[PDB]
Every structure is written in structure tokens, then in C-alpha cells.
């Protein structure tokens, strides 16, 4: 239909075990309720936590988190009784946190030029040891002056080297991560540097 009133603009699970959804009164108007029904199987269900989420949130803890199941949700907001409708599959709603300790290091090989030397580390929330995940990293570097950045895909490897680096300038560098079929992370904080001579 044409209108609809409140929008659920997203859901994001910080690790494939819990998820939060955020709605939005697109309405120029304790008058809202969230109800969901899992895949297939017909019972309606009211939202289970409206505290851990921030206002206009419905947080699904552990008994409510189910893998490989569609979630049919719709906000029921009345004071003006309206609605909308969304299908959320948890495996594709994952968005982790930025990596830690971007350790830069400018190195110096025997006769040739100076190259950088980065190393980083995964965000906290995700525990890879018994491996529910696969992180996918990226790095960007733009020298002080510079306009747009230059992006290198580090892959499943947490270390990296960028050749052809000139004494004369100073750069910035950020690393980032994404779980295999999910969402890119925020850019970690820029660790400035200066190439030697």
C-alpha cells in the first residue's frame, strides 16, 4: 500500500547471537509496540526487551535468537494506529566493531626504498578461536596532503606492507573489518605517521 507510518530502518547483530532492531516514527505525530512471528509457524509474539537498545529499539536476547529462521516483524504504533512489515534473516545482519591498535612502522631495506609496516587486531566481541567467524580486512592510507584515500584489501591477514614510500610526506592509516557475508565495520581511528630519510 501507499502510506505505512513507522519504519523499521534496520537490525544489526554484533556477533550472530543477539540482534537489535531500530524503528522510526516517519510520522509528523508509550504509543508503539513490536510484534514478530518466526518463519512459518504462525503464533504472533510481542517484542522481548525495549530497554537494552536505546529509544525505538527492540532487543532480542538469547532465547529469542535463532539461526536460519526468518523473522517477520512489524511495528504496531498507536495514538493514529499504524504499521509496516519486515523480513530479517540474522546471518546477513551482522556488523562488528573496528579493529584495535593500528601499529604502523616505517622500515628500511638495505639499498632500496622505505615501505610501511602495519599490523592490527580484531575487535573484541568476536571470538574466532572456535570459529563462528571469518573476518575480512581492509586498510586505507592517504598522505597528509592528499585528497581521496588508497584502499588495500588485506584479506584474512591481520598484517600488511605498502611499498613506494617517500621521505617527504606524512600519512594517515585506518584498518577495517567485515565478517564474511555481513557488514563493513567503522573505520578504526587514524594513526598518523611520517616517512623517514
Amino acid at each position: 500500500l501507499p502510506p505505512g507510518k513507522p519504519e523499521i530502518f534496520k537490525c544489526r547483530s554484533p556477533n550472530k547471537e543477539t540482534f537489535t532492531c531500530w524503528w522510526r516514527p516517519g510520522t509528523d505525530g508509550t504509543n508503539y509496540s513490536l510484534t514478530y512471528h518466526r518463519e512459518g509457524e504462525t503464533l504472533m509474539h510481542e517484542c522481548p526487551d525495549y530497554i537494552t537498545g536505546g529509544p525505538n529499539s527492540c532487543h532480542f536476547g538469547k532465547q529469542y535468537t535463532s539461526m536460519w529462521r526468518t523473522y517477520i516483524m512489524m511495528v504496531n504504533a498507536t495514538n493514529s494506529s499504524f504499521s509496516d512489515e519486515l523480513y530479517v534473516d540474522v546471518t546477513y545482519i551482522v556488523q562488528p566493531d573496528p579493529p584495535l591498535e593500528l601499529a604502523v612502522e616505517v622500515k628500511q631495506p638495505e639499498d632500496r626504498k622505505p615501505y610501511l609496516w602495519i599490523k592490527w587486531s580484531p575487535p573484541t566481541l568476536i571470538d574466532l578461536k572456535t570459529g563462528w567467524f571469518t573476518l575480512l580486512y581492509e586498510i586505507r592510507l592517504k598522505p597528509e596532503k592528499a585528497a581521496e584515500w588508497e584502499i588495500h584489501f588485506a584479506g584474512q591477514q591481520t598484517e600488511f606492507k605498502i611499498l613506494s614510500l617517500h621521505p617527504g610526506q606524512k600519512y594517515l592509516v585506518q584498518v577495517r573489518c567485515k565478517p564474511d557475508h555481513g557488514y563493513w565495520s567503522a573505520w578504526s581511528p587514524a594513526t598518523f605517521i611520517q616517512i623517514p630519510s
Binding site: 523480513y87 546471518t91 574466532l128 563462528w132 557475508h181
Partner: protein, 186 residues
């Protein structure tokens, strides 16, 4: 004769699981997007009837905890059942996968990848033997089928399921690659 390390043996399967996983995501996004797109959306999920997948008659884990609960052999097996189970349905899906703007689709004749992956896994499985009973969960090869006239809703119904099943397979192997192949994980 250098008896191939598990490094490669797992490493190699992970890409196959993965091509199978993207193929199904893309095409499905591709398909829902074109045929069966708006208020009609989830008619495949209409009511119980339609929605359920024949690739559900195999008891698969549904959380971290319990998916971390099935032994390396236990986990490997489901993956396989899944493969075999999707060996036929996907025959009817050629239609689907063929005019797919989504590259590799056509060229990569899906029954092949399934077939390939299928061997990779028995192998991974065998090497995780040394001979005890093959006891735990599913005993016999729980090989099912759905059917074989709403033509259009049906293809679509399948795509949803493949995507889902491609996913269970990748996710599981990854656990075993990590837990067994002590290194390239963390």
C-alpha cells in the same frame, strides 16, 4: 609421496562452500528482485504449507552453543546430507541459474559444484576416522524430497531454501577447519 596436509584439504573445500553460498545469495536477490517482488514477497512463506524446506527432515543445530555441541564428525555429516539432498531439486533450477546476470552461474553448472564438494567432504570425513563407530545423530542418510501448478512461486520457494542450505554447509565446515586444523583461524 607427501600425503597432502589438511591445510589444503580444508582450505580447498572452504572456497567450494563459498562459491555455492554466494551463487545462491546473488541469484535469489536477483530473482526475488525481478519475478515475485512486492506485497506478494513471501508467498513462499505463505502459511506452513509453502514455506517449509524438505532439507529440514535432517536435524541441524540452531545456535552457537548446540552447533558447537556436535562433534567434528557429527558436524561434517549434515553438510553432506545437505549436498546430496540438493542434488535433484537444483536440476529444475537450471532455468533460474542460466539467464543469471550474476556471473559464474551458467558456466558453473551447479550440479557439478555440488558433486565436487560432495567428494571433498567424504574425504574430510574419512580422515576424521581411525575407526570408531560412526555414532551420534542422524543414522541413515536422510535423503528427502519436496515434490516431483503454481510455476513462479515454486522456483522462488527453492531459491530461498538453497541459500539457506548453502549457508548451513559453509558455516559448519568452517567450524571443523578451525577446531582440527590448528593454525589459520585464531
Amino acid at each position: 609421496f607427501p600425503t597432502i596436509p589438511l591445510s589444503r584439504l580444508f582450505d580447498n573445500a572452504m572456497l567450494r562452500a563459498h562459491r555455492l553460498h554466494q551463487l545462491a545469495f546473488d541469484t535469489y536477490q536477483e530473482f526475488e528482485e525481478a519475478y515475485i517482488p512486492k506485497e506478494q514477497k513471501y508467498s513462499f512463506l505463505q502459511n506452513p504449507q509453502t514455506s517449509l524446506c524438505f532439507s529440514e527432515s535432517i536435524p541441524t543445530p540452531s545456535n552457537r552453543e548446540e552447533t558447537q555441541q556436535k562433534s567434528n564428525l557429527e558436524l561434517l555429516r549434515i553438510s553432506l546430507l545437505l549436498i546430496q539432498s540438493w542434488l535433484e531439486p537444483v536440476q529444475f533450477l537450471r532455468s533460474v541459474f542460466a539467464n543469471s546476470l550474476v556471473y559464474g552461474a551458467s558456466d558453473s553448472n551447479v550440479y557439478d559444484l555440488l558433486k565436487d564438494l560432495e567428494e571433498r567432504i567424504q574425504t574430510l570425513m574419512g580422515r576424521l576416522e581411525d575407526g570408531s563407530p560412526r555414532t551420534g545423530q542422524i543414522f541413515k542418510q536422510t535423503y528427502s524430497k519436496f515434490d516431483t501448478d503454481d510455476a513462479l512461486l515454486k522456483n522462488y520457494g527453492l531459491l530461498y531454501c538453497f541459500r539457506k542450505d548453502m549457508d548451513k554447509v559453509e558455516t559448519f565446515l568452517r567450524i571443523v577447519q578451525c577446531r582440527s586444523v590448528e593454525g589459520s583461524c585464531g
